[PDB]
Design an enzyme around this catalytic site. Structure first.
Site, PDB file in Angstrom:
ATOM      1  N   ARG A   1     -18.350 -38.482  -6.549  1.00 14.13           N
ATOM      2  CA  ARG A   1     -19.320 -38.399  -7.631  1.00 14.13           C
ATOM      3  C   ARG A   1     -19.115 -37.191  -8.532  1.00 14.13           C
ATOM      4  O   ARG A   1     -19.524 -37.226  -9.698  1.00 14.13           O
ATOM      5  CB  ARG A   1     -20.738 -38.386  -7.060  1.00 14.13           C
ATOM      6  CG  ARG A   1     -21.309 -39.774  -6.873  1.00 14.13           C
ATOM      7  CD  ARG A   1     -22.749 -39.729  -6.422  1.00 14.13           C
ATOM      8  NE  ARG A   1     -23.069 -40.860  -5.560  1.00 14.13           N
ATOM      9  CZ  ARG A   1     -23.944 -40.815  -4.567  1.00 14.13           C
ATOM     10  NH1 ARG A   1     -24.584 -39.700  -4.265  1.00 14.13           N
ATOM     11  NH2 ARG A   1     -24.174 -41.913  -3.854  1.00 14.13           N
TER      12      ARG A   1
HETATM   13  N1  LIG Z   1     -19.302 -46.793 -16.370  1.00 18.07           N
HETATM   14  C1  LIG Z   1     -18.668 -46.195 -15.335  1.00 18.07           C
HETATM   15  N2  LIG Z   1     -17.433 -45.673 -15.483  1.00 18.07           N
HETATM   16  C2  LIG Z   1     -16.797 -45.070 -14.463  1.00 18.07           C
HETATM   17  N3  LIG Z   1     -17.313 -44.944 -13.229  1.00 18.07           N
HETATM   18  C3  LIG Z   1     -18.544 -45.423 -12.941  1.00 18.07           C
HETATM   19  C4  LIG Z   1     -19.307 -46.088 -14.005  1.00 18.07           C
HETATM   20  N4  LIG Z   1     -20.478 -46.462 -13.463  1.00 18.07           N
HETATM   21  C5  LIG Z   1     -20.467 -46.070 -12.165  1.00 18.07           C
HETATM   22  N5  LIG Z   1     -19.316 -45.448 -11.855  1.00 18.07           N
HETATM   23  C6  LIG Z   1     -18.972 -44.900 -10.522  1.00 18.07           C
HETATM   24  O1  LIG Z   1     -19.905 -45.400  -9.565  1.00 18.07           O
HETATM   25  C7  LIG Z   1     -20.458 -44.348  -8.776  1.00 18.07           C
HETATM   26  C8  LIG Z   1     -21.963 -44.536  -8.665  1.00 18.07           C
HETATM   27  O2  LIG Z   1     -22.569 -43.256  -8.535  1.00 18.07           O
HETATM   28  P1  LIG Z   1     -24.139 -43.062  -8.808  1.00 18.07           P
HETATM   29  O3  LIG Z   1     -24.568 -44.051  -9.862  1.00 18.07           O
HETATM   30  O4  LIG Z   1     -24.370 -41.591  -9.045  1.00 18.07           O
HETATM   31  O5  LIG Z   1     -24.837 -43.442  -7.410  1.00 18.07           O
HETATM   32  P2  LIG Z   1     -25.762 -44.749  -7.265  1.00 18.07           P
HETATM   33  O6  LIG Z   1     -24.868 -45.883  -7.696  1.00 18.07           O
HETATM   34  O7  LIG Z   1     -26.146 -44.773  -5.806  1.00 18.07           O
HETATM   35  O8  LIG Z   1     -26.915 -44.467  -8.191  1.00 18.07           O
HETATM   36  C9  LIG Z   1     -20.115 -43.044  -9.472  1.00 18.07           C
HETATM   37  O9  LIG Z   1     -19.547 -42.126  -8.537  1.00 18.07           O
HETATM   38  C10 LIG Z   1     -19.095 -43.390 -10.533  1.00 18.07           C
HETATM   39  O10 LIG Z   1     -17.836 -42.817 -10.185  1.00 18.07           O
END
Ligand SMILES: Nc1ncnc2c1ncn2[C@@H]1O[C@H](COP(=O)(O)OP(=O)(O)O)[C@@H](O)[C@H]1O
Ligand SMILES: Nc1ncnc2c1ncn2[C@@H]1O[C@H](COP(=O)(O)OP(=O)(O)OP(=O)(O)O)[C@@H](O)[C@H]1O
Ligand SMILES: [Mg+2]
Lengths: 48, 463, 489, 129, 463, 129
Positions: free
Chosen positions: C352
């Site tokens: 993350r």
């Molecule tokens: N639009 C995007 N582009 C690149 N990576 C993404 C995108 N959306 C989500 N991710 C990846 O998915 C993971 C979801 O992390 P996060 O949203 O912080 O936790 P959760 O999904 O539990 O809320 C992130 O670490 C990120 O690397």
């Protein structure tokens, strides 16, 4: 054409047999699954 | 009068008051000589009340004395809460000084009646290709996000905040959120740079707090947002208020943790017997009554990546638009990872979004569903053993599946590509062209993270 | 009368005490014979306590009294290269520890206003982790896998790789056999990594309480450098054993059972521990040290380990702990037995923090290569049924195969920053597009050896300064080109 | 005619009340007297005879027969019709109308599955044409 | 100073004593006028203790007097227990008279400390060359014998018992409760007539015996094995010991009975047990201290598909080595019947045993896998259809699978030769030479029951 | 020679008694103690030696050996030998006789499956012929 027939026939037969065994497994799991929760729930009844 | 602690277990403390002074339910109690306060939960009779500590339990012993405030936990509301960060009880944690307000409201209150209820009439535009097509939003509606861990709930919520909540007339937004302290702090600094902070209020509670804190954090954000909804100036009648909640599950977890200690039998999958009522008393307050409009976005956590769990199953009935995130699509590389199927919105009606939009959405969903059922045959039978129309459906479904992905402005740190924002008409035109059979020669590779169709045409040259 | 009481029940390490009217929660109590315990629940007429030591010498009627202090553990720079138990008492028999400071075991994490975003890298020595799942100073990653899949090896490699980084390390072992702990200590001393490492041992012979308070004492030991403007790192070898010990100790205390037996506050138990690993801002440092050190920021990196049963990522603890950390490194048994020694599953493993915890050369060279592998997995899974393939599909498949076979590494063989940069640049530029699918490890091994023999100042500059410029990039390209010809594999 | 939009939520509320009242638990924590709950409710939808109407009204109405039709609604999770409450209520009613999720997405808007839907009264409840 | 029984349920017997004297945990109590004796599992207050009955439970009623020995149950240990059979309390049952040993040891003891552990991981060399190369043992490790009822599983035990004493001068102890199948002569008879009785001590228990006796059998053995290991020769070196605590019963109990070897009961005592402390302590007592080692061998019965990885892993988790017995191999006239492919060990690592041994291994297993895959093709038609470089593989696989045979000393009654004790280095040399292809010209069947490769050459020369 | 008609019904009766005695049910179909129930009974079948006979009879009988043979019978549900109770009994017996229903229906009257059934003691039991 004839060869395809036989091949296809075999597949159908196999599929049929497959379904049967899966059903058995499913039933087992089903029954097993239920038992577990009951035990846990009974444990809660003794938690007080 | 003054009560005395007689028993403490974890976070649950019972207090024995005199016969005539027993405090009522949800009343706040102050423990003398300590910063800890208690809230009532049950009346076990004989002058004994079971309570949960609102704070940490340090240096607490039996026989201590407690005083009754004879009122629920009250929080300050007004215009002076704008641009500040506060704890659950309403104390600043930004080291910027005390909040200068004298208007206070109780945290617990009843939901609005049937007579005061409204009807959503105007659409909301976000700029997401998949949201604007298969799941339209409505001003004053309700939106929910359903996904398992590491699928992209937080990134999507931040993108939504950036797209619509960044700049609009007097939106007086509100942000009751908790989760990871690293993602917090990053947000407070990110907004302070843009200057949006002078029109936002943030209530924040960490995830290492005792179960008492995590159980009542949301009821503070709702209380602060209701004041913005209801207040009116010279017939101004307030302004559209936005709410963003990221801690709904933590509420259920705290309830589950305390249910066993409060003395209640378990139900279903190790869940509390009163799940539905506890969800209802919270989700019936987040509404747009006739006197004002509230648009709310919620993050909902799906345990074990199954939607049939009792926690996410009860929530489906309380939302107008539901967006479901799938682990398979996320692991496939496509982001935003939204499932075209199992994603519905009540505003998807021919009398609301028009006629062309409805037909486009229905055709896309039909094509995807038809392609979904052909995977087992291709697994068993060769790809050549399919009808030509089935092959066309498979190819077009693959192109469409890649076409729902676009790069975001917020996720630039992860990839480095700049963000994009596509208007609705461009999405409609592109999908209409795709379903018609044009764009067939273009390889399916050129449809990944490429914003509007013209960029697809341009990218077709390279790869 | 308010401070002394009698034991009324002894069973399986739990002691019930009468009296003790003025007793606090978590307070320490002393028993006759030098045995200490802690109070965990205070009912209307009784105090439940757990014994820290051997409880078989306690009998009904023995007196007990409250000390008046919370549990504390010695801490300082003199605990480096030493093995202790959960209470900090040495067990390797090298003499007493000249303790100067004692710190509390249970404490709260710093507030949100006192923290700072992580922007400094932590090197592990694995190509698949330094490029796809970056780790920064202050980020709490997680290692999750089935039994016998290589979880302990990665943590030890991470500890070893910090020889020159100047960051201290702490290792905690819970519910492990004494032989494995001895072997681990021997391996640590053999490579010279013991000069900056402390070991906390709570083996299977030790009581349940010792297996439940070990991570807290380890984190308290590791926070000494965090609070004083230095960087630290801590590795918990297994938290599932801690969960089992907590479940047992709670069930013996007459507390209602929950789902899968675990009672409530398991999530609280695992969250109040992992929330203490963070990067703190400078101003907190000057405030804490009262101006002794200025312009310095601390950190504390955590690498907890969780094991699953038959690949179950859906149970109580595996789901509870994933939602707390900042990423997961996921390990397959199917890939471990296949031949992929660092069996790391791309697509399901995320970081993350992202590119904010990398050097400039690594950040810009390795741009979005995890997504390429995630797409390649599905493309290869689907293309088997396809009758014919377009040129674009074949190129992607070949590149995916090359990348998958490139990121295989041998144990106890760390790679420097320059080696990773050279390999990533060669992969991205496609210089191995003609190299056969097999004999890939030979190719990059020989390439790394050749660039280590020659172009030495360039590699030294890359290692000391993480920088990529037209003149830094040109030499690397020319060297690979020079190596491409006039060489053998 | 009477329509109950969800008997599942009524069952959930009944389970909550019984659990809070300490009645003994059972599969899915449902109390023992749960089949009787829906049995005593659904059996009141009946067509009485002319004699019953003549007796109840004390001769005010003659030669007329009453009726009452019920249309209960039940939601299932992931198509598991083998759950406790769906099985309890299926055995009580006189027929079933099954709505499929795949047919809804495929374009069949009413989404009625013919093949597993049955009516026990049958063709006796239709006009001539 | 005497107690009275107040409650007798199942295996649990609550006894009550005065306030001044209450027996400590693990103390032994004697019931007046009855053979039975009791052990103190836990204290319940008010001078009341909970106990499990060890001696025979006949004529046990509420209100009988009980006296206290103020000491744990002690068992005789020495060199005079060799060749004798005893019950859990150490009283002889073979009608051979008393035991001349006058020294006793308590059966409850702490595990060795961290400073007493071994400097390095050494390997236990046995006479079976199949084990020493495919699944080597470790001093202090744990071994699990997986196999069906077709193989007696006893000839290998006898061979190990003889080999350890012949090579490393180590005595062994056998502790068992009940006999799963009696088809072979009883173990005492099988030893008596194999002349290995002098080197072993035996502890036995019957199912139809007080439940306390069925438990605590392993403790009685472990104590004897510990006394055997520490005793030192004139040089001062200790002795290695093998503990054959055979799995008492099937996974129905084994799941909670194999854990009895580590301190968990198979639903034997309904009332509160105190075996959590016993867990780990009973498991961390089988180690290689600086003076000597105690290696535990535990059988196990598996019907099908419940061994190694697909096993429930309740027992497979802690086992350092697994030896699998194949019915097909036994039916093919090969003894011992140990399948190389299924048998696995954690000591087959280049760091612990060496790169030479590791590279010698995993090469024969490759040949076995290739032959197994080609078996069907070999079944379909002979070497004539087979191409080049696979006939050589088939021949080498046959040669090695026949070379796995070895004479046993335990069968000297039916063997003209006195058996062989092949050194590990000789086995490594022979297998390396055979893998090099040099011994290809050696005619087949010269590797069969000829033991060492050197003997095989002479057999090839003579015929 | 003793023949128990069905030990499975004995297991059912024991389970009923145990459940009526308010003992915990557990996560299995039957309580674990059932295992002991089928062992203590099946251990008592053995052949004593001539010395034991003389000792028991005080010299009234000499030069003779006792015996006791047991033939328990167990019923399986749909040919499942992997169930809790059938697995326990198989592990504590010296041989098994497998009667298949497919062979029974398909003409073969004594349906003794020789592929799976085994005695484990050959020649010693049989006479010379
Ligand atoms: N639009 C995007 N582009 C690149 N990576 C993404 C995108 N959306 C989500 N991710 C990846 O998915 C993971 C979801 O992390 P996060 O949203 O912080 O936790 P959760 O999904 O539990 O809320 C992130 O670490 C990120 O690397
Ligand atoms: N990268 C690697 N290359 C080669 N071998 C490896 C690698 N990583 C681990 N191994 C080997 O695989 C085995 C795994 O051992 P390890 O101690 O790492 O497992 P674990 O997951 O910690 O197991 P346990 O559950 O017993 O703690 C060891 O034999 C180790 O030497
Ligand atoms: Mg490990």
């Amino acid at each position: 054409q004839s060869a395809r027939m036989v091949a296809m026939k075999a597949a159908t037969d196999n599929a049929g047999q497959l379904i049967k065994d899966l059903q058995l497994i499913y039933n087992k799991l089903r029954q097993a699954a239920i038992t577990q929760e009951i035990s846990e729930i009974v444990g809660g009844a003794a938690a007080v | 009068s003054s009560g005395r602690i007689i028993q403490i277990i974890g976070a649950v403390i019972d207090v024995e008051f005199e016969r005539t002074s027993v405090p009522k339910i949800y009343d706040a109690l102050q423990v003398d000589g300590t910063e800890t306060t208690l809230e009532v939960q049950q009346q076990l009779g004989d002058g004994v009340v079971r309570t949960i500590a609102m704070g940490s339990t340090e240096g607490l012993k039996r026989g201590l004395t407690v005083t009754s405030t004879n009122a629920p936990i009250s929080v300050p509301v007004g215009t002076a809460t704008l641009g500040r960060i506060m704890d659950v009880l309403g104390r600043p944690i930004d080291e910027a000084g005390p909040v200068a307000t004298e208007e206070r409201l109780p945290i617990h209150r009843q939901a609005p009646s049937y007579a005061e209820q409204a009807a959503s009439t105007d659409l909301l535009e976000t700029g997401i290709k998949v949201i604007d097509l298969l799941c339209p939003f409505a001003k004053g509606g309700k939106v929910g996000l359903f996904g398992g861990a590491g699928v992209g709930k937080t990134v999507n919520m931040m993108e939504l905040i950036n797209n619509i909540a960044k700049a609009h007339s007097g939106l007086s937004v509100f942000a009751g959120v908790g989760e990871r302290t690293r993602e917090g702090n990053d947000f407070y600094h990110e907004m302070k740079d843009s200057n949006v902070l002078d029109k936002v209020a943030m209530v924040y509670g960490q995830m290492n707090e005792p179960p008492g804190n995590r159980l009542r954090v949301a009821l503070t954000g709702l209380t602060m947002a209701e004041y913005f909804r209801d207040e009116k100036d010279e017939n101004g009648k307030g302004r559209d208020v936005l709410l963003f909640v990221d801690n709904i599950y933590r509420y259920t977890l705290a309830g589950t943790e305390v249910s066993a200690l409060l003395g209640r039998m378990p139900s279903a999958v190790g869940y509390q017997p009163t799940l539905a009522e506890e969800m209802g008393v919270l989700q019936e307050r987040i509404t747009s009554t006739k006197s004002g409009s509230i648009t709310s976005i919620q993050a909902v956590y799906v345990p074990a990546d199954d939607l049939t769990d009792p926690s996410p199953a009860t929530t489906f009935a309380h939302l107008d638009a539901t967006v479901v995130l799938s682990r398979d699509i996320a692991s496939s590389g496509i982001y935003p990872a939204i499932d075209p199927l199992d994603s519905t919105s009540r505003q998807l009606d021919p009398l609301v979004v028009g006629q062309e939009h409805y037909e486009i959405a229905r055709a896309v969903q039909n094509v995807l569903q038809r392609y979904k059922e052909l995977k087992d045959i291709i697994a068993i039978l060769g790809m050549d053993e399919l009808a030509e129309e089935d092959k066309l459906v498979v190819y077009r479904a693959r192109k469409i599946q890649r076409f729902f992905s676009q790069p975001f402005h917020v996720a630039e740190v992860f990839t480095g590509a700049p963000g994009k924002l596509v208007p609705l008409k461009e999405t409609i035109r592109g999908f209409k062209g795709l379903l018609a059979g044009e764009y067939d020669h273009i390889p399916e590779q050129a449809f990944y993270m490429v914003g509007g169709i013209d960029e697809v045409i341009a990218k077709a040259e390279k790869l | 009368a308010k401070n002394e009481g009698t034991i009324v029940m002894v069973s399986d390490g739990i002691v019930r005490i009468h009296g003790l009217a003025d007793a606090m929660y978590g307070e320490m109590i002393e028993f006759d014979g030098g045995l200490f315990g802690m109070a965990l629940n205070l009912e209307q007429d009784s105090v439940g306590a757990v014994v820290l030591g051997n409880y078989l010498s306690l009998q009904e009627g023995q007196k007990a009294r409250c000390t008046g202090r919370v549990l504390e553990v010695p801490v300082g720079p003199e605990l480096l290269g030493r093995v202790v138990d959960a209470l900090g008492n040495p067990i390797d028999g090298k003499g007493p520890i000249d303790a100067k400071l004692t710190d509390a075991v249970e404490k709260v994490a710093p507030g949100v206003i006192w923290r700072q975003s992580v922007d400094q890298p932590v090197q592990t020595g694995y190509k698949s982790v330094d490029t796809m799942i970056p780790v920064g100073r202050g980020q709490r990653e997680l290692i999750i896998g089935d039994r016998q899949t290589g979880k302990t090896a990665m943590a030890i490699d991470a500890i070893i790789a910090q020889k020159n980084s100047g960051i201290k390390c702490v290792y905690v072992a819970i519910g492990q056999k004494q032989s494995t702990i001895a072997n681990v200590v021997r391996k640590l001393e053999e490579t010279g990594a013991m000069a900056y490492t402390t070991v906390v041992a709570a083996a299977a012979a030790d009581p349940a309480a010792m297996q439940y308070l070990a991570p807290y004492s380890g984190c308290t030991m590791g926070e000494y450098f965090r609070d004083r403007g230095e960087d630290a790192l801590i590795i918990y070898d297994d938290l599932s054993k801690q969960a089992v010990a907590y479940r047992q100790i709670s069930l013996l205390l007459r507390r209602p059972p929950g789902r899968e037996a675990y009672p409530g506050d398991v999530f609280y138990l695992h969250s109040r521990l992992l929330e203490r690993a963070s990067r703190v801002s400078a101003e907190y440092v000057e405030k804490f040290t009262n101006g002794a050190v200025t312009g310095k920021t601390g950190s504390l990196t955590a690498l907890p380990i969780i094991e699953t049963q038959a690949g179950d990522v859906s149970a109580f603890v595996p789901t509870n702990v994933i939602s707390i950390t900042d990423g997961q490194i996921f390990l397959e048994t199917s890939l471990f037995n296949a031949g992929i020694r660092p069996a790391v599953n791309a697509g399901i493993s995320v970081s993350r923090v992202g590119g904010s915890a990398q050097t400039k050369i690594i950040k810009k060279l390795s741009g979005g290569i995890r997504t390429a592998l995630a797409q390649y997995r599905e493309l290869a899974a689907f293309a088997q049924f396809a009758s014919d393939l377009d040129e674009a599909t074949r190129k992607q498949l070949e590149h995916g195969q090359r990348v998958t076979e490139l990121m295989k590494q041998k144990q106890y063989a760390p790679y420097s920053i320059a080696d990773q940069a050279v390999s990533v640049y060669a992969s991205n530029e496609g210089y191995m597009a003609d190299v056969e699918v097999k004999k890939i490890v030979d190719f990059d091994a020989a390439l790394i050896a050749y660039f280590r023999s020659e172009y030495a100042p360039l590699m030294k500059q890359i290692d000391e300064t993480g920088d990529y410029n037209k003149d830094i990039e040109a030499a690397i390209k020319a060297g690979i080109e020079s190596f491409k010809a006039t060489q053998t594999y």
